[PDB]
Coordinates of C-alpha atoms in Angstrom, one line a residue:
Chain A
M1 CA 114.1 81.8 88.6
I2 CA 110.9 83.7 89.9
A3 CA 107.9 81.3 90.4
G4 CA 106.1 78.8 92.6
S5 CA 105.4 79.6 96.2
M6 CA 106.5 83.2 97.0
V7 CA 105.9 84.4 100.5
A8 CA 104.4 87.8 100.9
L9 CA 106.6 88.5 103.9
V10 CA 105.5 90.4 106.9
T11 CA 107.7 93.1 108.5
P12 CA 108.2 92.3 112.2
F13 CA 108.0 95.2 114.5
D14 CA 108.8 95.1 118.3
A15 CA 106.2 96.1 120.9
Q16 CA 107.1 99.7 120.2
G17 CA 106.5 99.3 116.6
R18 CA 110.3 99.7 115.8
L19 CA 111.8 97.3 113.2
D20 CA 113.1 94.0 114.6
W21 CA 116.0 92.6 112.7
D22 CA 116.4 89.5 114.7
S23 CA 112.9 88.3 113.8
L24 CA 113.4 89.4 110.2
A25 CA 116.3 87.0 110.0
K26 CA 114.5 84.0 111.5
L27 CA 111.6 84.4 109.0
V28 CA 114.1 84.4 106.2
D29 CA 116.0 81.4 107.5
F30 CA 112.5 79.9 108.1
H31 CA 111.8 80.3 104.4
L32 CA 115.3 79.4 103.3
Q33 CA 115.0 76.2 105.2
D34 CA 111.4 75.1 104.5
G35 CA 111.4 75.5 100.7
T36 CA 110.0 78.9 99.8
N37 CA 110.9 79.7 96.2
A38 CA 110.9 83.6 96.5
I39 CA 110.4 86.2 99.1
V40 CA 108.4 89.3 98.4
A41 CA 109.7 92.0 100.8
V42 CA 107.9 95.1 101.8
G43 CA 104.7 94.5 99.9
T44 CA 101.1 94.8 101.2
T45 CA 101.5 92.0 103.9
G46 CA 104.7 93.7 104.8
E47 CA 102.8 96.9 105.7
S48 CA 104.4 99.0 102.9
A49 CA 102.1 101.9 103.7
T50 CA 103.6 102.6 107.2
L51 CA 107.4 102.4 106.4
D52 CA 109.8 105.3 105.9
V53 CA 111.4 105.2 102.5
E54 CA 114.5 104.5 104.8
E55 CA 113.1 101.5 106.6
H56 CA 111.8 100.2 103.2
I57 CA 115.3 100.0 101.5
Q58 CA 116.8 98.7 104.7
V59 CA 114.4 95.8 104.8
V60 CA 115.1 95.0 101.2
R61 CA 118.8 95.2 101.8
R62 CA 118.8 92.9 104.8
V63 CA 116.7 90.3 103.2
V64 CA 118.8 90.5 100.0
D65 CA 122.1 90.3 102.0
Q66 CA 120.7 87.4 104.0
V67 CA 119.5 85.4 101.0
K68 CA 122.8 85.7 99.0
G69 CA 121.3 84.8 95.6
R70 CA 120.0 81.5 96.9
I71 CA 116.4 82.6 96.1
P72 CA 114.8 85.6 94.4
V73 CA 113.9 88.7 96.5
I74 CA 111.2 90.8 95.1
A75 CA 110.5 94.2 96.6
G76 CA 107.2 96.0 96.8
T77 CA 107.6 99.4 95.1
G78 CA 104.3 100.5 93.7
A79 CA 102.8 103.9 94.6
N80 CA 99.9 105.9 93.4
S81 CA 102.2 108.6 91.9
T82 CA 104.3 107.5 88.9
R83 CA 107.3 109.5 90.0
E84 CA 107.4 107.8 93.4
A85 CA 107.1 104.3 91.9
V86 CA 110.1 105.1 89.9
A87 CA 112.1 106.3 92.9
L88 CA 111.1 103.3 95.1
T89 CA 111.8 101.0 92.2
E90 CA 115.2 102.6 91.5
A91 CA 115.8 102.2 95.2
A92 CA 115.0 98.5 95.2
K93 CA 117.3 97.8 92.2
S94 CA 120.4 99.6 93.6
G95 CA 119.5 97.8 96.7
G96 CA 119.8 94.2 95.4
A97 CA 116.2 93.0 94.7
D98 CA 115.9 90.6 91.8
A99 CA 112.6 92.1 90.8
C100 CA 109.9 94.6 92.0
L101 CA 106.2 94.1 92.7
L102 CA 104.1 97.1 91.7
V103 CA 100.5 97.5 92.7
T104 CA 98.3 99.6 90.3
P105 CA 97.7 103.2 91.4
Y106 CA 95.1 103.1 94.2
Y107 CA 93.3 106.2 95.4
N108 CA 93.5 108.3 92.3
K109 CA 91.6 105.8 89.9
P110 CA 93.7 106.2 86.6
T111 CA 92.1 105.5 83.3
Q112 CA 93.2 102.2 81.6
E113 CA 95.4 104.4 79.4
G114 CA 97.0 106.1 82.4
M115 CA 97.8 102.7 83.9
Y116 CA 99.6 101.7 80.7
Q117 CA 101.6 104.9 80.6
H118 CA 102.3 104.6 84.3
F119 CA 103.8 101.1 84.1
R120 CA 105.5 101.6 80.7
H121 CA 107.3 104.6 82.2
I122 CA 108.6 102.7 85.3
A123 CA 109.6 99.8 83.0
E124 CA 111.5 102.2 80.9
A125 CA 113.0 104.2 83.7
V126 CA 114.6 101.3 85.8
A127 CA 116.5 98.4 84.5
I128 CA 114.9 95.7 86.7
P129 CA 112.2 93.1 86.2
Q130 CA 108.8 94.3 87.2
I131 CA 105.6 92.4 88.0
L132 CA 102.2 94.1 87.8
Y133 CA 99.8 93.7 90.8
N134 CA 96.0 93.9 90.4
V135 CA 93.8 94.0 93.5
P136 CA 90.6 96.0 93.0
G137 CA 89.4 95.2 96.5
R138 CA 92.1 97.7 97.8
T139 CA 92.9 100.1 94.9
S140 CA 89.3 100.8 93.9
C141 CA 90.3 100.4 90.2
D142 CA 90.8 97.4 87.9
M143 CA 93.4 96.7 85.3
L144 CA 91.5 95.1 82.5
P145 CA 92.9 92.2 80.4
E146 CA 93.5 94.3 77.3
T147 CA 95.7 96.6 79.4
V148 CA 97.7 93.7 80.7
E149 CA 98.4 92.3 77.2
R150 CA 99.5 95.8 76.1
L151 CA 101.9 95.9 79.1
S152 CA 103.0 92.3 78.5
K153 CA 104.8 93.6 75.3
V154 CA 106.9 96.0 77.4
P155 CA 110.5 94.8 77.8
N156 CA 110.9 94.7 81.6
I157 CA 107.4 93.7 82.6
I158 CA 107.8 90.0 83.3
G159 CA 104.5 89.1 84.8
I160 CA 101.4 90.0 86.8
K161 CA 100.0 89.3 90.2
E162 CA 96.2 88.7 89.7
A163 CA 94.4 89.0 93.1
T164 CA 90.7 89.3 92.1
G165 CA 90.4 85.6 92.9
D166 CA 88.4 85.3 89.7
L167 CA 89.4 82.4 87.6
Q168 CA 87.5 83.6 84.6
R169 CA 89.6 86.7 84.7
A170 CA 92.9 84.8 85.2
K171 CA 92.2 82.5 82.3
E172 CA 91.5 85.5 80.2
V173 CA 94.8 87.1 80.9
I174 CA 96.5 83.8 80.2
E175 CA 94.9 83.3 76.9
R176 CA 95.9 86.9 75.8
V177 CA 99.6 86.9 76.7
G178 CA 102.8 85.3 75.6
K179 CA 104.3 82.2 77.3
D180 CA 107.1 84.4 78.5
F181 CA 104.6 86.5 80.5
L182 CA 104.2 84.9 83.9
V183 CA 100.8 85.0 85.7
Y184 CA 100.8 84.7 89.5
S185 CA 98.0 84.2 92.0
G186 CA 97.3 86.9 94.6
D187 CA 94.5 84.8 96.1
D188 CA 95.6 82.0 98.4
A189 CA 92.3 80.1 98.3
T190 CA 92.1 79.6 94.5
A191 CA 95.8 79.7 93.5
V192 CA 95.8 76.0 92.7
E193 CA 93.3 76.4 89.9
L194 CA 95.1 79.4 88.5
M195 CA 98.3 77.4 88.3
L196 CA 96.6 74.4 86.5
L197 CA 95.2 76.8 83.9
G198 CA 98.8 78.1 83.2
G199 CA 99.6 80.3 86.2
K200 CA 103.3 80.2 87.3
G201 CA 103.0 80.6 91.1
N202 CA 101.3 82.1 94.1
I203 CA 102.4 85.2 96.1
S204 CA 100.8 84.1 99.3
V205 CA 100.0 85.2 102.8
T206 CA 99.5 81.5 103.8
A207 CA 103.1 80.8 102.9
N208 CA 104.0 83.0 105.9
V209 CA 102.9 80.2 108.3
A210 CA 103.0 77.1 106.1
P211 CA 106.0 77.6 103.8
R212 CA 106.8 73.8 103.2
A213 CA 103.1 73.0 102.5
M214 CA 102.7 75.8 100.1
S215 CA 105.7 75.0 98.0
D216 CA 104.4 71.4 97.8
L217 CA 101.1 72.7 96.7
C218 CA 102.7 74.9 94.0
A219 CA 105.0 72.2 92.6
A220 CA 102.1 69.8 92.3
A221 CA 99.8 72.4 90.6
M222 CA 102.6 73.6 88.3
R223 CA 103.5 69.9 87.5
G224 CA 99.9 69.0 86.5
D225 CA 99.3 66.8 89.6
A226 CA 95.9 68.4 90.1
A227 CA 95.0 65.7 92.6
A228 CA 97.9 66.5 95.0
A229 CA 97.2 70.2 94.6
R230 CA 93.6 70.1 95.6
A231 CA 94.4 67.8 98.4
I232 CA 97.0 69.9 100.1
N233 CA 94.7 72.8 99.2
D234 CA 91.5 71.6 100.8
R235 CA 93.6 70.7 103.8
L236 CA 95.0 74.2 104.0
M237 CA 91.6 75.8 103.2
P238 CA 90.6 76.7 106.7
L239 CA 94.0 78.5 107.3
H240 CA 93.5 80.3 104.0
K241 CA 90.2 81.6 105.3
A242 CA 91.2 82.3 108.8
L243 CA 94.1 84.3 107.6
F244 CA 91.6 86.9 106.4
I245 CA 88.9 87.1 109.1
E246 CA 90.2 90.6 109.6
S247 CA 92.2 92.6 107.0
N248 CA 95.6 91.3 106.2
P249 CA 98.1 91.2 107.7
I250 CA 96.3 91.6 111.0
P251 CA 95.8 87.8 111.3
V252 CA 99.0 86.5 109.8
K253 CA 101.1 88.5 112.3
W254 CA 98.9 87.1 115.2
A255 CA 99.7 83.7 113.9
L256 CA 103.3 84.5 113.5
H257 CA 103.5 85.8 117.0
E258 CA 101.8 82.6 118.3
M259 CA 104.4 80.4 116.7
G260 CA 107.0 82.5 118.4
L261 CA 108.5 84.0 115.2
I262 CA 107.6 87.7 115.6
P263 CA 106.9 90.3 118.4
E264 CA 103.4 91.8 118.9
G265 CA 103.9 94.9 116.7
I266 CA 101.8 96.4 114.0
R267 CA 101.6 100.1 112.9
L268 CA 98.6 102.4 112.9
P269 CA 96.2 102.4 111.3
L270 CA 96.4 98.6 111.6
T271 CA 95.4 97.0 114.9
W272 CA 96.2 93.7 116.6
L273 CA 93.8 90.8 115.7
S274 CA 90.9 91.8 117.9
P275 CA 90.1 89.3 120.7
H276 CA 86.9 87.7 119.2
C277 CA 88.9 86.4 116.3
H278 CA 91.8 84.7 118.1
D279 CA 90.2 81.3 118.6
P280 CA 88.9 80.6 115.1
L281 CA 92.5 81.3 113.7
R282 CA 93.9 79.3 116.6
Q283 CA 91.7 76.4 115.7
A284 CA 92.6 76.5 112.1
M285 CA 96.3 76.5 113.0
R286 CA 96.0 73.4 115.2
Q287 CA 94.1 71.4 112.5
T288 CA 96.5 72.4 110.0
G289 CA 99.4 71.3 112.2
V290 CA 101.3 74.5 112.1
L291 CA 100.7 75.0 115.8
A292 CA 100.5 72.0 118.0
Chain B
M1 CA 83.7 130.3 109.2
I2 CA 83.8 126.7 107.7
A3 CA 80.7 125.7 105.6
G4 CA 78.7 126.4 102.5
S5 CA 80.4 126.3 99.1
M6 CA 83.9 124.9 99.6
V7 CA 85.7 124.4 96.3
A8 CA 87.9 121.3 96.0
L9 CA 90.5 123.3 94.2
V10 CA 92.7 121.9 91.4
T11 CA 96.5 122.5 91.5
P12 CA 97.5 123.9 88.2
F13 CA 100.4 122.5 86.4
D14 CA 102.1 123.8 83.2
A15 CA 102.6 121.7 80.2
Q16 CA 105.7 120.1 81.6
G17 CA 103.9 119.4 84.8
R18 CA 105.4 122.1 87.0
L19 CA 103.4 124.1 89.5
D20 CA 101.9 127.2 88.0
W21 CA 101.7 129.9 90.6
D22 CA 100.2 132.6 88.3
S23 CA 97.4 130.3 87.4
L24 CA 96.9 129.3 91.1
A25 CA 96.5 133.0 91.9
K26 CA 93.7 133.5 89.3
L27 CA 91.8 130.5 90.7
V28 CA 92.1 132.1 94.1
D29 CA 91.0 135.5 92.8
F30 CA 88.2 133.9 90.9
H31 CA 86.8 132.2 94.0
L32 CA 87.3 135.3 96.2
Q33 CA 85.6 137.2 93.4
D34 CA 82.6 134.9 92.7
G35 CA 81.8 134.3 96.4
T36 CA 83.2 130.8 97.3
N37 CA 82.7 130.1 101.0
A38 CA 86.1 128.3 101.6
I39 CA 89.0 126.8 99.7
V40 CA 90.2 123.2 100.0
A41 CA 93.8 123.2 98.8
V42 CA 95.8 120.0 97.9
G43 CA 92.9 117.5 98.4
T44 CA 91.9 114.7 96.0
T45 CA 90.9 117.1 93.1
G46 CA 94.2 119.0 93.8
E47 CA 95.9 115.8 92.8
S48 CA 97.5 115.2 96.3
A49 CA 98.9 111.8 95.3
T50 CA 101.5 113.4 92.9
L51 CA 102.7 116.3 95.1
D52 CA 106.1 116.2 97.0
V53 CA 105.7 117.5 100.5
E54 CA 107.7 120.4 99.2
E55 CA 104.9 121.3 96.8
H56 CA 102.2 120.4 99.4
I57 CA 103.3 123.3 101.8
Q58 CA 104.3 125.6 99.0
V59 CA 100.7 125.4 97.8
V60 CA 98.9 125.6 101.1
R61 CA 101.1 128.6 102.1
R62 CA 100.5 130.5 98.8
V63 CA 96.7 130.1 99.1
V64 CA 96.7 131.2 102.6
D65 CA 98.9 134.2 102.0
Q66 CA 96.8 135.3 99.1
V67 CA 93.5 134.7 101.0
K68 CA 94.7 137.1 103.8
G69 CA 92.3 135.6 106.3
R70 CA 89.0 136.4 104.5
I71 CA 88.0 132.9 103.8
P72 CA 89.0 129.6 105.5
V73 CA 91.7 127.5 103.8
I74 CA 91.4 123.7 104.3
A75 CA 94.5 121.7 103.4
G76 CA 94.3 117.9 102.6
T77 CA 96.5 116.0 105.0
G78 CA 95.3 112.4 105.0
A79 CA 97.5 109.4 104.3
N80 CA 97.1 105.7 104.8
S81 CA 99.9 105.9 107.4
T82 CA 99.1 107.6 110.8
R83 CA 102.6 109.0 111.2
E84 CA 102.5 110.6 107.7
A85 CA 99.1 112.0 108.4
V86 CA 100.4 113.7 111.5
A87 CA 103.4 114.9 109.5
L88 CA 101.3 116.4 106.8
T89 CA 98.8 117.9 109.3
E90 CA 101.7 119.5 111.3
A91 CA 103.1 121.0 108.0
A92 CA 99.6 122.4 107.2
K93 CA 99.0 124.0 110.6
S94 CA 102.5 125.4 110.7
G95 CA 101.8 126.7 107.2
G96 CA 98.6 128.7 108.0
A97 CA 95.7 126.5 107.0
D98 CA 92.6 127.1 109.2
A99 CA 91.6 123.5 109.1
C100 CA 92.8 120.2 107.6
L101 CA 91.0 117.7 105.4
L102 CA 91.9 114.0 106.2
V103 CA 90.6 111.1 104.0
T104 CA 90.5 107.7 105.6
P105 CA 93.3 105.2 105.1
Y106 CA 93.0 104.0 101.5
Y107 CA 94.7 100.7 100.8
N108 CA 95.5 99.0 104.0
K109 CA 91.8 98.7 105.0
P110 CA 92.0 99.3 108.7
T111 CA 89.4 98.0 111.1
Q112 CA 86.7 100.5 112.4
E113 CA 88.6 100.6 115.7
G114 CA 91.8 101.3 113.8
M115 CA 90.2 104.2 112.0
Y116 CA 89.2 105.5 115.4
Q117 CA 92.6 105.3 116.9
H118 CA 94.2 106.7 113.8
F119 CA 92.1 109.9 113.6
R120 CA 92.2 110.2 117.4
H121 CA 96.0 110.3 117.3
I122 CA 96.1 113.0 114.6
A123 CA 93.6 115.2 116.5
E124 CA 95.6 114.8 119.8
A125 CA 98.9 115.3 118.0
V126 CA 98.2 118.6 116.2
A127 CA 96.3 121.6 117.5
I128 CA 94.3 122.4 114.4
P129 CA 90.7 121.7 113.3
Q130 CA 90.3 118.4 111.4
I131 CA 87.6 117.2 109.1
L132 CA 87.2 113.4 108.3
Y133 CA 86.5 112.4 104.6
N134 CA 84.7 109.1 103.8
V135 CA 84.7 108.1 100.2
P136 CA 84.7 104.2 99.9
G137 CA 84.7 104.3 96.0
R138 CA 88.3 105.3 96.2
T139 CA 89.5 104.1 99.5
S140 CA 88.1 100.5 99.3
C141 CA 87.0 100.9 103.0
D142 CA 84.0 102.6 104.7
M143 CA 84.0 104.4 108.0
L144 CA 80.7 103.5 109.7
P145 CA 78.2 105.8 111.4
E146 CA 79.2 104.6 114.9
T147 CA 82.9 105.4 114.2
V148 CA 81.9 109.0 113.2
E149 CA 79.9 109.5 116.5
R150 CA 82.9 108.3 118.5
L151 CA 85.3 110.6 116.7
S152 CA 82.7 113.4 116.9
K153 CA 83.4 113.5 120.6
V154 CA 87.1 114.3 120.1
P155 CA 87.9 117.9 120.8
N156 CA 89.0 119.2 117.4
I157 CA 87.6 116.9 114.9
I158 CA 85.0 119.5 113.7
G159 CA 83.2 117.5 111.0
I160 CA 83.2 115.0 108.1
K161 CA 83.1 115.1 104.4
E162 CA 80.6 112.3 103.5
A163 CA 81.0 111.2 99.9
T164 CA 79.0 108.1 99.4
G165 CA 76.1 110.0 97.9
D166 CA 73.9 107.8 100.1
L167 CA 71.4 110.0 101.9
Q168 CA 70.2 107.4 104.4
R169 CA 73.8 107.4 105.5
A170 CA 74.0 111.2 105.7
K171 CA 70.8 111.3 107.9
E172 CA 72.2 108.6 110.1
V173 CA 75.4 110.6 110.8
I174 CA 73.5 113.8 111.2
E175 CA 71.1 112.2 113.6
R176 CA 73.9 110.6 115.7
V177 CA 76.3 113.7 116.0
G178 CA 76.2 116.8 118.1
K179 CA 75.1 119.9 116.4
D180 CA 78.7 121.3 116.8
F181 CA 79.9 118.5 114.5
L182 CA 79.3 119.4 110.9
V183 CA 78.4 117.1 108.0
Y184 CA 79.6 118.2 104.5
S185 CA 78.8 116.6 101.2
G186 CA 81.3 114.9 99.0
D187 CA 78.9 114.2 96.2
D188 CA 78.0 117.2 94.1
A189 CA 74.8 115.8 92.7
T190 CA 73.2 115.2 96.0
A191 CA 74.8 117.8 98.2
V192 CA 71.5 119.8 98.2
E193 CA 69.7 117.0 99.8
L194 CA 72.5 116.5 102.3
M195 CA 72.2 120.1 103.5
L196 CA 68.4 120.2 103.4
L197 CA 68.8 117.2 105.8
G198 CA 71.0 119.0 108.3
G199 CA 74.3 119.1 106.5
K200 CA 76.5 122.3 106.5
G201 CA 78.2 122.3 103.2
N202 CA 79.6 120.8 99.9
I203 CA 83.3 120.4 99.3
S204 CA 82.6 120.7 95.6
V205 CA 84.2 119.9 92.4
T206 CA 81.5 121.6 90.3
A207 CA 82.4 124.7 92.3
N208 CA 85.6 124.7 90.3
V209 CA 83.8 126.0 87.2
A210 CA 80.7 127.6 88.7
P211 CA 81.6 129.1 92.1
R212 CA 78.8 131.7 92.1
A213 CA 76.0 129.1 91.3
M214 CA 77.3 126.6 93.9
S215 CA 77.5 129.4 96.5
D216 CA 73.9 130.4 95.9
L217 CA 72.9 126.7 95.8
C218 CA 74.4 126.1 99.2
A219 CA 72.9 129.2 100.7
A220 CA 69.3 128.3 99.6
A221 CA 69.9 124.7 100.7
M222 CA 71.3 125.7 104.1
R223 CA 68.5 128.2 104.7
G224 CA 65.8 125.7 104.0
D225 CA 64.7 127.0 100.7
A226 CA 64.4 123.5 99.2
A227 CA 62.6 124.7 96.1
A228 CA 65.3 127.2 95.2
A229 CA 68.1 124.7 96.0
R230 CA 66.8 121.9 93.9
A231 CA 66.0 124.3 91.0
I232 CA 69.6 125.6 91.0
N233 CA 70.5 121.9 91.2
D234 CA 68.7 120.2 88.4
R235 CA 69.8 123.2 86.3
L236 CA 73.5 122.4 87.3
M237 CA 72.8 118.7 87.0
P238 CA 74.4 118.1 83.6
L239 CA 77.6 119.7 84.8
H240 CA 77.6 117.6 87.9
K241 CA 77.4 114.6 85.6
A242 CA 79.9 115.6 83.0
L243 CA 82.5 116.6 85.5
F244 CA 82.9 112.9 86.3
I245 CA 82.8 111.5 82.7
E246 CA 86.3 110.2 83.6
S247 CA 87.9 110.1 87.1
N248 CA 87.9 113.5 88.7
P249 CA 90.1 115.6 88.5
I250 CA 90.6 114.7 84.8
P251 CA 87.4 116.3 83.6
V252 CA 87.4 119.4 85.8
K253 CA 90.9 120.4 84.6
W254 CA 89.8 120.2 81.0
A255 CA 86.9 122.5 81.8
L256 CA 89.3 124.9 83.7
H257 CA 91.7 125.1 80.8
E258 CA 88.9 125.7 78.2
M259 CA 87.9 128.6 80.3
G260 CA 91.3 130.1 80.1
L261 CA 92.1 129.6 83.8
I262 CA 94.8 126.9 83.9
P263 CA 97.3 125.2 81.6
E264 CA 96.9 121.6 80.1
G265 CA 99.0 119.9 82.8
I266 CA 98.1 116.8 84.8
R267 CA 100.4 114.3 86.5
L268 CA 100.8 110.6 85.8
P269 CA 99.0 108.3 86.4
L270 CA 96.4 110.7 85.3
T271 CA 95.8 111.5 81.7
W272 CA 94.1 114.5 79.9
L273 CA 90.4 114.1 79.1
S274 CA 90.3 111.5 76.3
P275 CA 89.2 112.9 73.0
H276 CA 85.8 111.2 73.0
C277 CA 84.6 113.1 76.1
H278 CA 85.3 116.6 74.9
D279 CA 82.1 117.6 73.4
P280 CA 79.8 116.1 76.0
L281 CA 81.5 118.3 78.6
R282 CA 81.7 121.3 76.3
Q283 CA 77.9 121.0 75.8
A284 CA 77.3 120.8 79.6
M285 CA 79.4 123.8 80.2
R286 CA 77.5 125.9 77.6
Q287 CA 74.2 124.7 78.9
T288 CA 75.1 125.9 82.3
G289 CA 76.4 129.2 81.2
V290 CA 79.9 128.6 82.3
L291 CA 81.2 128.7 78.7
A292 CA 79.3 131.0 76.3

C-alpha cells in the first residue's frame, strides 16, 4: 500500500529542543485527515542526525501506534556504517514501521560495489521492506542506475527514492527495473514529471504544509491526468521553492510553526529560518492559501 | 607541539573486521621511528564511520599510552550532531588525546551561522584543543573563510584542516586569521604550497606509507625551502595520486598490507582495493621507494 504522497515528516521539538508529543500527534491527525498516503518518520526532514537511538524508535512507535494500520509508516534508518543501518533497521521493524527508508552512505564515499553489498546485507539481515534513497547533494556520492537495477533484484528492496531532481536519471532507473520496483520522487518541484514517466509517488517536504494538495497532485500524475498535475504543480511551485531557501528542514519548520502546528524548536547544527528569509516564505504560503 | 607531518592513521582490522592491536602498535612504532610529527587517530582515514564508541576510545587510549607523551595525539571527534560531537570530544579528552579533530556537519547542511554555533558549543563544552576540518567533497557543505575567522577567535579552537586543495582559499584563511591560529592541509598533493603560503602542516594520508619523506617535505616547506619541498613533492606525486585511485582509505590500506604492516580488513560499506587498481598502486609504491 506504499505510494502517492508520502510526507517526509518533521520532528517537532519544544523551545528547549525536547521532543513534543502533543505536536507530533496533531501532525499525524493532520495527515490522517487531509489525505496523506504514507508518513515517513525520522528521515532527513525529521532531523535524523540529531536524535538519540532512543528518541528515534520512540518517534517511530508513537506514529505507528497513532496510525493503527490506516496508512503506511516508513522509518528513516540509513547510516554511513552498514552495522548501524542494520541495527536502526532492526529497531524500526520490531517497532512497527511498515518499511524503512535508507539513504546511501554519506561521508565515507563507498564504491558502487560497496553500496550494493551494503544494501544487500541490510536487506538480508532484517525482514522488512526497504527503500533506497539517493541524494548526492548531501551524501557526496551517487548510486548509479546499474547499481540500482542490481539491487532491484534483491528480495526486500521494494523501491528507490530518487532525489537528484534529474528526470533523465529517473527515466533511466525506470527503464532498467521491473514493474514491481517502485520509483519515488525525492524532489518536490519535479515529482509530477517523474510520476508521469512511471514513478509511483513523492516523498515530499511540501506535503508537510499542503497535504491535501499534494495527494491530489500525486493521484492525478499517477492516473495519467498530466493536465491536473501540472496545474496543481505550477500553483504549488512557489511553496516548493520557498521550502528550500535555506537547508531543509529549516524552512518547513518555520512554516509549520506559523500555522500553529509545532513549537519553535530545532537542534544544532540547524538554526531557525534566519530573519531575511521569513517574508518570501510567508508570501508563498499566503498565495498558496495554506496560511491566510 | 602540533604541526608538520601529521599522519591520518588507519585503524587496522583483521580479516573478520575486528580491531588489531598488534598491528596498531607497529604503525605507532613505525611513525615514532620514522619521524612523524603527530598522529591523528580515528579520523576519516581511520574509518571513523564504522567504529562503536567503545572502539573509538579504546583506540585513542591505546595510541596515547604507547606514545607516552612524545608526540601529540589528535583524535577525530566530529559528528553531524552537536551533542554527539561534544560527547566524542569529551571521551577523547578524558582519554588522553592532546587535541581533537572535528569535521564539519556532513549531511544536514547547516547554515554558516549554524556551523559557528555548533563549533563554538564544542569549544566551550570541553576543555581541550580543537581543530576544524573542512572537506566539502565529502560533507556536501563548505565552511566559508568568514566563518573560520569568527571561530578563530574562540579560546581553544587552535586551527583548521583545509581540504579543498584550493590554494586561493588557503591564502584567504591564512590572511584572515591570527598567527596563533594554524592552517593545516587536507590535500596531500598541494600541502607543500599550503605551508609555503603560511600553513603549518599536513594531516597526511601519504604519510601512512612514507612517514620519513613526508616529515622532510613538511620541514623544508615550513622552513621556506620551496625548492626542496617541491622536489620532494613531485617525487612523491605518483603516490599522492595513486593513494586515491578509489576513495581513501581503500587504497592506503592495500598499500599498508602489501608492506606487511596491517591485515586485509576494511569495514562495510568500504571494499578492498578492486583488482584493477593493484598494479598502478604497486608501481607508484615501487617508484617512490616505499616498496622495493
